[PDB]
Design a protein around this ligand. Sequence first.
Ligand SMILES: [Zn+2]
Ligand SMILES: [Zn+2]
Lengths: 114, 134, 49, 96
Amino acid sequence: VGIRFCQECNNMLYPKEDKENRILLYACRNCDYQQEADNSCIYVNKITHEVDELTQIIADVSQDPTLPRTEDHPCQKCGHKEAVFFQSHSARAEDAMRLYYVCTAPHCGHRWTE
Amino acid sequence: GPSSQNVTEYVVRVPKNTTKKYNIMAFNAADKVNFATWNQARLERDLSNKPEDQPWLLRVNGKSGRKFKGIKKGGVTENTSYYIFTQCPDGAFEAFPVHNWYNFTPLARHRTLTAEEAEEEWERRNKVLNHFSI
Amino acid sequence: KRHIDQLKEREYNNYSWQDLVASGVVEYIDTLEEETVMLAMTPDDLQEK
Amino acid sequence: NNELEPTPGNTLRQTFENQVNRILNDARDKTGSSAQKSLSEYNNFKSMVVSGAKGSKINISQVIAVVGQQNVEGKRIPFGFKHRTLPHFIKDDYGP
Ligand SMILES: [Zn+2]
Ligand SMILES: [Zn+2]
Protein backbone atom coordinates (compact mmCIF):
# COMPACT_ATOMS: atom_id res chain seq x y z
CA VAL A 1 0.00 0.00 0.00
CA GLY A 2 2.99 2.25 0.65
CA ILE A 3 5.82 3.21 -1.71
CA ARG A 4 9.32 1.86 -2.36
CA PHE A 5 12.42 3.87 -3.22
CA CYS A 6 15.51 2.47 -4.93
CA GLN A 7 18.58 1.99 -2.75
CA GLU A 8 21.03 3.17 -5.43
CA CYS A 9 19.57 6.11 -7.37
CA ASN A 10 16.72 7.01 -4.96
CA ASN A 11 13.83 6.68 -7.39
CA MET A 12 10.43 5.00 -7.52
CA LEU A 13 10.46 1.21 -7.51
CA TYR A 14 7.91 -0.33 -9.88
CA PRO A 15 6.38 -3.78 -9.40
CA LYS A 16 7.37 -6.53 -11.81
CA GLU A 17 6.62 -10.22 -12.30
CA ASP A 18 9.12 -13.04 -12.84
CA LYS A 19 8.08 -16.35 -14.40
CA GLU A 20 10.35 -18.52 -12.23
CA ASN A 21 9.29 -18.56 -8.56
CA ARG A 22 5.91 -16.76 -8.76
CA ILE A 23 6.93 -13.90 -6.44
CA LEU A 24 6.41 -10.15 -6.79
CA LEU A 25 9.64 -8.28 -7.53
CA TYR A 26 10.09 -4.53 -7.18
CA ALA A 27 12.31 -3.15 -9.93
CA CYS A 28 13.78 0.22 -10.87
CA ARG A 29 13.65 1.80 -14.37
CA ASN A 30 16.92 3.85 -14.13
CA CYS A 31 18.99 1.10 -12.41
CA ASP A 32 17.83 -2.53 -12.10
CA TYR A 33 17.98 -2.93 -8.32
CA GLN A 34 15.67 -5.73 -7.20
CA GLN A 35 13.87 -7.09 -4.16
CA GLU A 36 10.78 -9.10 -3.28
CA ALA A 37 7.46 -7.89 -1.90
CA ASP A 38 6.37 -8.77 1.63
CA ASN A 39 2.63 -8.00 1.47
CA SER A 40 2.06 -8.99 -2.19
CA CYS A 41 -0.66 -6.44 -2.90
CA ILE A 42 -0.36 -3.32 -5.00
CA TYR A 43 -3.51 -1.24 -5.42
CA VAL A 44 -6.28 -0.32 -2.98
CA ASN A 45 -9.08 2.23 -3.50
CA LYS A 46 -11.32 3.25 -0.59
CA ILE A 47 -14.63 4.56 -1.92
CA THR A 48 -16.57 4.58 1.36
CA HIS A 49 -14.18 7.29 2.60
CA GLU A 50 -15.44 6.75 6.16
CA VAL A 51 -12.22 7.98 7.75
CA ASP A 52 -12.84 9.06 11.32
CA GLU A 53 -11.36 12.52 11.79
CA LEU A 54 -10.25 11.48 15.27
CA THR A 55 -7.00 10.77 13.40
CA GLN A 56 -6.79 14.22 11.81
CA ILE A 57 -7.62 16.74 14.56
CA ILE A 58 -4.75 18.22 16.54
CA ALA A 59 -4.42 18.50 20.31
CA ASP A 60 -3.52 22.20 20.36
CA VAL A 61 -7.00 23.25 19.22
CA SER A 62 -7.81 23.64 22.93
CA GLN A 63 -5.89 26.95 22.79
CA ASP A 64 -8.53 28.61 20.60
CA PRO A 65 -10.45 31.48 22.24
CA THR A 66 -13.28 31.24 19.71
CA LEU A 67 -14.61 27.75 20.48
CA PRO A 68 -17.37 26.72 22.89
CA ARG A 69 -16.59 24.91 26.12
CA THR A 70 -18.41 22.49 28.40
CA GLU A 71 -18.49 21.45 32.04
CA ASP A 72 -20.67 18.37 31.51
CA HIS A 73 -18.42 15.87 29.74
CA PRO A 74 -15.14 15.28 31.61
CA CYS A 75 -12.02 13.66 30.25
CA GLN A 76 -11.51 9.95 30.88
CA LYS A 77 -7.72 9.70 30.67
CA CYS A 78 -7.13 12.48 33.22
CA GLY A 79 -10.46 13.36 34.85
CA HIS A 80 -10.46 17.03 33.84
CA LYS A 81 -13.97 18.49 33.82
CA GLU A 82 -13.63 20.97 30.94
CA ALA A 83 -13.77 20.18 27.24
CA VAL A 84 -14.02 22.06 23.95
CA PHE A 85 -16.20 20.68 21.18
CA PHE A 86 -16.78 21.33 17.49
CA GLN A 87 -18.05 19.81 14.27
CA SER A 88 -16.46 17.99 11.32
CA HIS A 89 -15.67 21.24 9.43
CA SER A 90 -14.53 19.12 6.47
CA ALA A 91 -16.02 17.31 3.49
CA ARG A 92 -18.34 14.28 3.78
CA ALA A 93 -20.97 16.70 5.07
CA GLU A 94 -24.04 14.65 4.17
CA ASP A 95 -24.95 13.58 7.71
CA ALA A 96 -22.17 15.41 9.52
CA MET A 97 -23.46 16.95 12.72
CA ARG A 98 -21.44 14.84 15.12
CA LEU A 99 -19.56 16.54 17.92
CA TYR A 100 -15.90 15.76 18.57
CA TYR A 101 -14.42 16.82 21.91
CA VAL A 102 -10.90 17.68 23.05
CA CYS A 103 -9.73 17.88 26.64
CA THR A 104 -8.42 21.29 27.64
CA ALA A 105 -6.09 20.23 30.46
CA PRO A 106 -2.46 21.05 29.64
CA HIS A 107 -0.55 18.07 28.25
CA CYS A 108 -3.53 15.72 27.95
CA GLY A 109 -4.70 16.20 24.36
CA HIS A 110 -7.21 13.38 24.67
CA ARG A 111 -9.82 13.32 21.90
CA TRP A 112 -13.10 11.45 21.65
CA THR A 113 -16.43 11.50 19.84
CA GLU A 114 -19.76 10.39 21.25
CA GLY B 1 35.33 12.95 32.21
CA PRO B 2 37.32 15.88 30.78
CA SER B 3 34.39 16.90 28.56
CA SER B 4 32.61 17.54 31.85
CA GLN B 5 35.36 18.84 34.13
CA ASN B 6 37.74 19.87 31.33
CA VAL B 7 39.10 23.43 31.45
CA THR B 8 41.61 25.44 29.42
CA GLU B 9 42.55 28.76 27.81
CA TYR B 10 44.24 29.37 24.45
CA VAL B 11 45.36 32.41 22.43
CA VAL B 12 43.60 33.33 19.17
CA ARG B 13 45.26 35.01 16.19
CA VAL B 14 43.79 36.23 12.90
CA PRO B 15 46.62 36.54 10.34
CA LYS B 16 46.10 39.26 7.73
CA ASN B 17 47.38 36.88 5.06
CA THR B 18 47.46 33.24 3.98
CA THR B 19 49.31 31.12 1.42
CA LYS B 20 46.07 29.62 0.17
CA LYS B 21 42.40 30.52 -0.12
CA TYR B 22 40.11 28.62 2.24
CA ASN B 23 36.83 27.10 1.10
CA ILE B 24 34.23 24.75 2.56
CA MET B 25 33.60 21.32 1.06
CA ALA B 26 30.26 20.04 2.33
CA PHE B 27 28.86 16.51 2.12
CA ASN B 28 25.41 15.14 2.90
CA ALA B 29 25.63 13.15 6.13
CA ALA B 30 22.94 10.82 4.76
CA ASP B 31 25.53 9.36 2.39
CA LYS B 32 28.02 8.64 5.21
CA VAL B 33 30.99 8.74 2.84
CA ASN B 34 34.03 6.72 3.92
CA PHE B 35 36.90 9.11 3.21
CA ALA B 36 39.31 6.19 3.72
CA THR B 37 38.00 4.78 0.44
CA TRP B 38 39.35 7.86 -1.27
CA ASN B 39 42.73 6.64 -2.48
CA GLN B 40 43.00 9.69 -4.69
CA ALA B 41 40.89 12.52 -6.04
CA ARG B 42 40.89 14.93 -8.94
CA LEU B 43 39.36 18.37 -8.56
CA GLU B 44 38.53 20.65 -11.48
CA ARG B 45 36.08 23.39 -12.31
CA ASP B 46 32.99 22.08 -14.14
CA LEU B 47 33.00 22.13 -17.95
CA SER B 48 29.25 22.61 -18.58
CA ASN B 49 29.98 26.32 -18.12
CA LYS B 50 32.05 25.96 -21.27
CA PRO B 51 36.74 30.52 -13.28
CA GLU B 52 36.52 31.51 -9.61
CA ASP B 53 32.73 31.20 -9.92
CA GLN B 54 32.94 27.83 -11.65
CA PRO B 55 31.34 24.87 -9.89
CA TRP B 56 33.82 22.20 -8.84
CA LEU B 57 34.06 18.74 -10.33
CA LEU B 58 35.45 16.16 -7.93
CA ARG B 59 36.69 12.86 -9.26
CA VAL B 60 37.73 10.41 -6.56
CA ASN B 61 40.53 7.90 -7.15
CA GLY B 62 42.11 9.23 -10.33
CA LYS B 63 40.99 6.96 -13.21
CA SER B 64 38.46 4.56 -11.60
CA GLY B 65 36.66 6.36 -8.74
CA ARG B 66 33.57 8.33 -7.63
CA LYS B 67 32.40 11.75 -8.93
CA PHE B 68 30.57 14.72 -7.35
CA LYS B 69 29.47 18.17 -8.50
CA GLY B 70 29.90 21.18 -6.24
CA ILE B 71 27.61 24.19 -6.58
CA LYS B 72 28.45 27.56 -5.02
CA LYS B 73 26.20 28.90 -2.26
CA GLY B 74 24.50 32.25 -2.86
CA GLY B 75 26.43 34.02 -0.12
CA VAL B 76 29.10 33.40 2.51
CA THR B 77 29.97 36.80 3.99
CA GLU B 78 26.79 38.73 3.28
CA ASN B 79 26.21 39.40 6.97
CA THR B 80 28.77 37.35 8.88
CA SER B 81 32.17 35.99 7.89
CA TYR B 82 32.97 32.33 8.50
CA TYR B 83 36.24 31.35 10.08
CA ILE B 84 38.26 28.16 10.26
CA PHE B 85 39.74 27.67 13.72
CA THR B 86 42.78 25.39 13.90
CA GLN B 87 44.76 24.08 16.86
CA CYS B 88 48.51 24.64 16.81
CA PRO B 89 51.33 22.77 18.63
CA ASP B 90 51.63 25.75 21.00
CA GLY B 91 48.01 25.20 21.99
CA ALA B 92 47.11 28.64 20.65
CA PHE B 93 44.32 28.87 18.11
CA GLU B 94 44.66 30.02 14.52
CA ALA B 95 41.66 31.32 12.60
CA PHE B 96 41.24 31.08 8.85
CA PRO B 97 38.67 32.95 6.73
CA VAL B 98 36.15 31.01 4.62
CA HIS B 99 36.36 32.31 1.06
CA ASN B 100 33.44 30.31 -0.41
CA TRP B 101 30.78 27.62 0.12
CA TYR B 102 30.41 24.86 -2.42
CA ASN B 103 27.70 22.20 -2.26
CA PHE B 104 28.82 18.74 -3.17
CA THR B 105 26.36 16.00 -4.29
CA PRO B 106 26.59 12.40 -5.52
CA LEU B 107 26.30 11.53 -9.23
CA ALA B 108 24.46 8.79 -11.12
CA ARG B 109 26.74 7.40 -13.85
CA HIS B 110 23.92 5.13 -15.20
CA ARG B 111 20.95 5.40 -17.70
CA THR B 112 20.81 7.89 -20.64
CA LEU B 113 17.27 8.76 -21.90
CA THR B 114 17.18 10.93 -25.08
CA ALA B 115 14.99 14.07 -25.74
CA GLU B 116 13.26 13.90 -29.17
CA GLU B 117 13.36 10.11 -28.87
CA ALA B 118 11.64 10.21 -25.48
CA GLU B 119 8.84 12.48 -26.72
CA GLU B 120 8.27 10.27 -29.76
CA GLU B 121 8.10 7.19 -27.54
CA TRP B 122 5.55 8.89 -25.26
CA GLU B 123 3.15 9.70 -28.14
CA ARG B 124 3.21 6.13 -29.50
CA ARG B 125 2.59 4.77 -26.01
CA ASN B 126 -0.18 7.34 -25.58
CA LYS B 127 -1.56 6.35 -28.98
CA VAL B 128 -1.35 2.63 -28.20
CA LEU B 129 -3.56 3.00 -25.10
CA ASN B 130 -6.26 4.75 -27.22
CA HIS B 131 -6.16 2.06 -29.98
CA PHE B 132 -8.08 -1.25 -29.68
CA SER B 133 -10.78 0.08 -27.36
CA ILE B 134 -14.09 -1.66 -26.62
CA LYS C 1 -9.38 54.10 35.63
CA ARG C 2 -5.89 55.62 35.90
CA HIS C 3 -5.92 56.01 32.11
CA ILE C 4 -9.21 57.93 32.02
CA ASP C 5 -8.73 60.53 34.75
CA GLN C 6 -5.47 61.53 33.04
CA LEU C 7 -6.89 61.38 29.51
CA LYS C 8 -9.57 63.99 30.24
CA GLU C 9 -6.72 66.48 30.70
CA ARG C 10 -4.94 66.47 27.32
CA GLU C 11 -5.14 70.27 27.15
CA TYR C 12 -2.36 70.88 29.70
CA ASN C 13 -0.90 67.41 30.28
CA ASN C 14 0.49 66.25 26.89
CA TYR C 15 -1.06 62.80 27.19
CA SER C 16 -3.00 61.66 24.16
CA TRP C 17 -3.78 58.77 21.82
CA GLN C 18 -0.12 58.07 21.10
CA ASP C 19 0.72 57.58 24.77
CA LEU C 20 -2.21 55.16 24.86
CA VAL C 21 -0.98 52.82 22.12
CA ALA C 22 2.57 52.85 23.48
CA SER C 23 1.27 51.56 26.82
CA GLY C 24 -0.31 48.39 25.45
CA VAL C 25 -4.02 48.92 26.08
CA VAL C 26 -5.23 49.28 22.47
CA GLU C 27 -4.05 47.62 19.29
CA TYR C 28 -4.64 47.81 15.55
CA ILE C 29 -6.19 44.65 14.12
CA ASP C 30 -6.09 43.86 10.40
CA THR C 31 -8.69 41.80 8.53
CA LEU C 32 -6.61 38.63 8.20
CA GLU C 33 -5.61 38.75 11.87
CA GLU C 34 -9.31 39.25 12.66
CA GLU C 35 -9.98 35.56 11.98
CA THR C 36 -7.79 34.36 14.87
CA VAL C 37 -9.44 36.61 17.46
CA MET C 38 -12.43 36.40 19.82
CA LEU C 39 -14.24 39.71 20.30
CA ALA C 40 -16.59 40.91 23.01
CA MET C 41 -19.00 43.72 22.04
CA THR C 42 -19.30 45.38 25.45
CA PRO C 43 -17.31 44.98 28.68
CA ASP C 44 -19.88 45.25 31.46
CA ASP C 45 -22.10 42.63 29.82
CA LEU C 46 -19.98 39.99 28.05
CA GLN C 47 -17.04 39.59 30.47
CA GLU C 48 -18.94 38.39 33.53
CA LYS C 49 -18.36 34.89 34.88
CA ASN D 1 -26.44 13.25 19.20
CA ASN D 2 -27.41 11.83 15.90
CA GLU D 3 -31.08 11.19 16.61
CA LEU D 4 -32.45 12.75 13.43
CA GLU D 5 -33.57 10.63 10.48
CA PRO D 6 -33.41 12.19 7.01
CA THR D 7 -36.50 12.11 4.82
CA PRO D 8 -36.53 10.71 1.26
CA GLY D 9 -34.52 13.02 -0.96
CA ASN D 10 -33.24 15.20 1.90
CA THR D 11 -29.75 15.57 3.34
CA LEU D 12 -29.45 15.75 7.13
CA ARG D 13 -28.64 19.46 6.96
CA GLN D 14 -31.68 19.87 4.71
CA THR D 15 -33.90 17.82 6.75
CA PHE D 16 -32.19 19.56 9.71
CA GLU D 17 -32.41 23.27 8.63
CA ASN D 18 -35.76 22.80 6.77
CA GLN D 19 -37.30 21.41 10.00
CA VAL D 20 -35.77 24.38 11.91
CA ASN D 21 -37.17 26.77 9.22
CA ARG D 22 -40.64 25.14 9.51
CA ILE D 23 -40.57 25.68 13.32
CA LEU D 24 -39.46 29.33 12.81
CA ASN D 25 -42.28 29.88 10.25
CA ASP D 26 -44.87 28.43 12.68
CA ALA D 27 -43.61 30.73 15.48
CA ARG D 28 -43.70 33.78 13.13
CA ASP D 29 -47.27 32.90 11.99
CA LYS D 30 -48.41 32.62 15.65
CA THR D 31 -46.82 36.02 16.49
CA GLY D 32 -48.48 37.61 13.42
CA SER D 33 -51.90 36.15 14.35
CA SER D 34 -51.49 37.53 17.91
CA ALA D 35 -50.56 40.99 16.52
CA GLN D 36 -53.62 40.97 14.17
CA LYS D 37 -55.86 39.81 17.09
CA SER D 38 -55.43 43.17 18.88
CA LEU D 39 -56.78 46.31 17.07
CA SER D 40 -59.63 48.77 17.58
CA GLU D 41 -62.30 50.19 15.30
CA TYR D 42 -60.72 53.67 15.59
CA ASN D 43 -57.29 52.40 14.47
CA ASN D 44 -55.91 54.20 11.44
CA PHE D 45 -53.77 51.34 10.12
CA LYS D 46 -56.79 49.05 9.90
CA SER D 47 -58.60 51.90 8.15
CA MET D 48 -56.13 51.95 5.23
CA VAL D 49 -55.74 48.17 5.13
CA VAL D 50 -59.45 47.32 5.13
CA SER D 51 -60.45 49.80 2.43
CA GLY D 52 -57.55 48.55 0.31
CA ALA D 53 -56.08 52.01 -0.22
CA LYS D 54 -52.51 51.35 0.93
CA GLY D 55 -50.78 48.67 2.97
CA SER D 56 -51.09 44.99 3.78
CA LYS D 57 -51.96 42.85 6.78
CA ILE D 58 -48.30 41.95 7.38
CA ASN D 59 -47.08 45.53 7.89
CA ILE D 60 -49.39 45.75 10.90
CA SER D 61 -47.76 42.72 12.51
CA GLN D 62 -44.27 43.90 11.57
CA VAL D 63 -44.89 47.29 13.20
CA ILE D 64 -46.61 45.90 16.28
CA ALA D 65 -45.41 42.34 16.88
CA VAL D 66 -42.29 40.94 15.15
CA VAL D 67 -40.14 41.91 12.17
CA GLY D 68 -39.46 38.24 11.41
CA GLN D 69 -36.59 36.30 9.88
CA GLN D 70 -34.19 37.69 7.28
CA ASN D 71 -32.56 35.66 4.51
CA VAL D 72 -30.17 36.25 1.59
CA GLU D 73 -30.30 34.24 -1.64
CA GLY D 74 -33.49 32.60 -0.42
CA LYS D 75 -31.73 30.93 2.50
CA ARG D 76 -30.76 31.73 6.07
CA ILE D 77 -27.94 34.19 6.83
CA PRO D 78 -24.69 32.51 5.74
CA PHE D 79 -21.40 32.07 7.57
CA GLY D 80 -19.48 35.06 6.24
CA PHE D 81 -16.67 34.67 8.74
CA LYS D 82 -15.26 31.16 9.22
CA HIS D 83 -17.96 29.16 11.06
CA ARG D 84 -19.49 32.41 12.35
CA THR D 85 -21.74 35.22 11.17
CA LEU D 86 -20.17 37.98 13.29
CA PRO D 87 -17.32 38.17 15.79
CA HIS D 88 -19.86 38.45 18.64
CA PHE D 89 -20.95 34.78 18.54
CA ILE D 90 -19.21 31.50 19.31
CA LYS D 91 -18.43 29.12 16.48
CA ASP D 92 -21.10 26.92 14.86
CA ASP D 93 -24.05 28.56 16.59
CA TYR D 94 -27.28 27.51 14.87
CA GLY D 95 -29.78 29.27 17.12
CA PRO D 96 -32.49 31.57 15.83
ZN1 LIG E 1 16.90 2.71 -8.93
ZN1 LIG F 1 -7.97 15.08 29.63
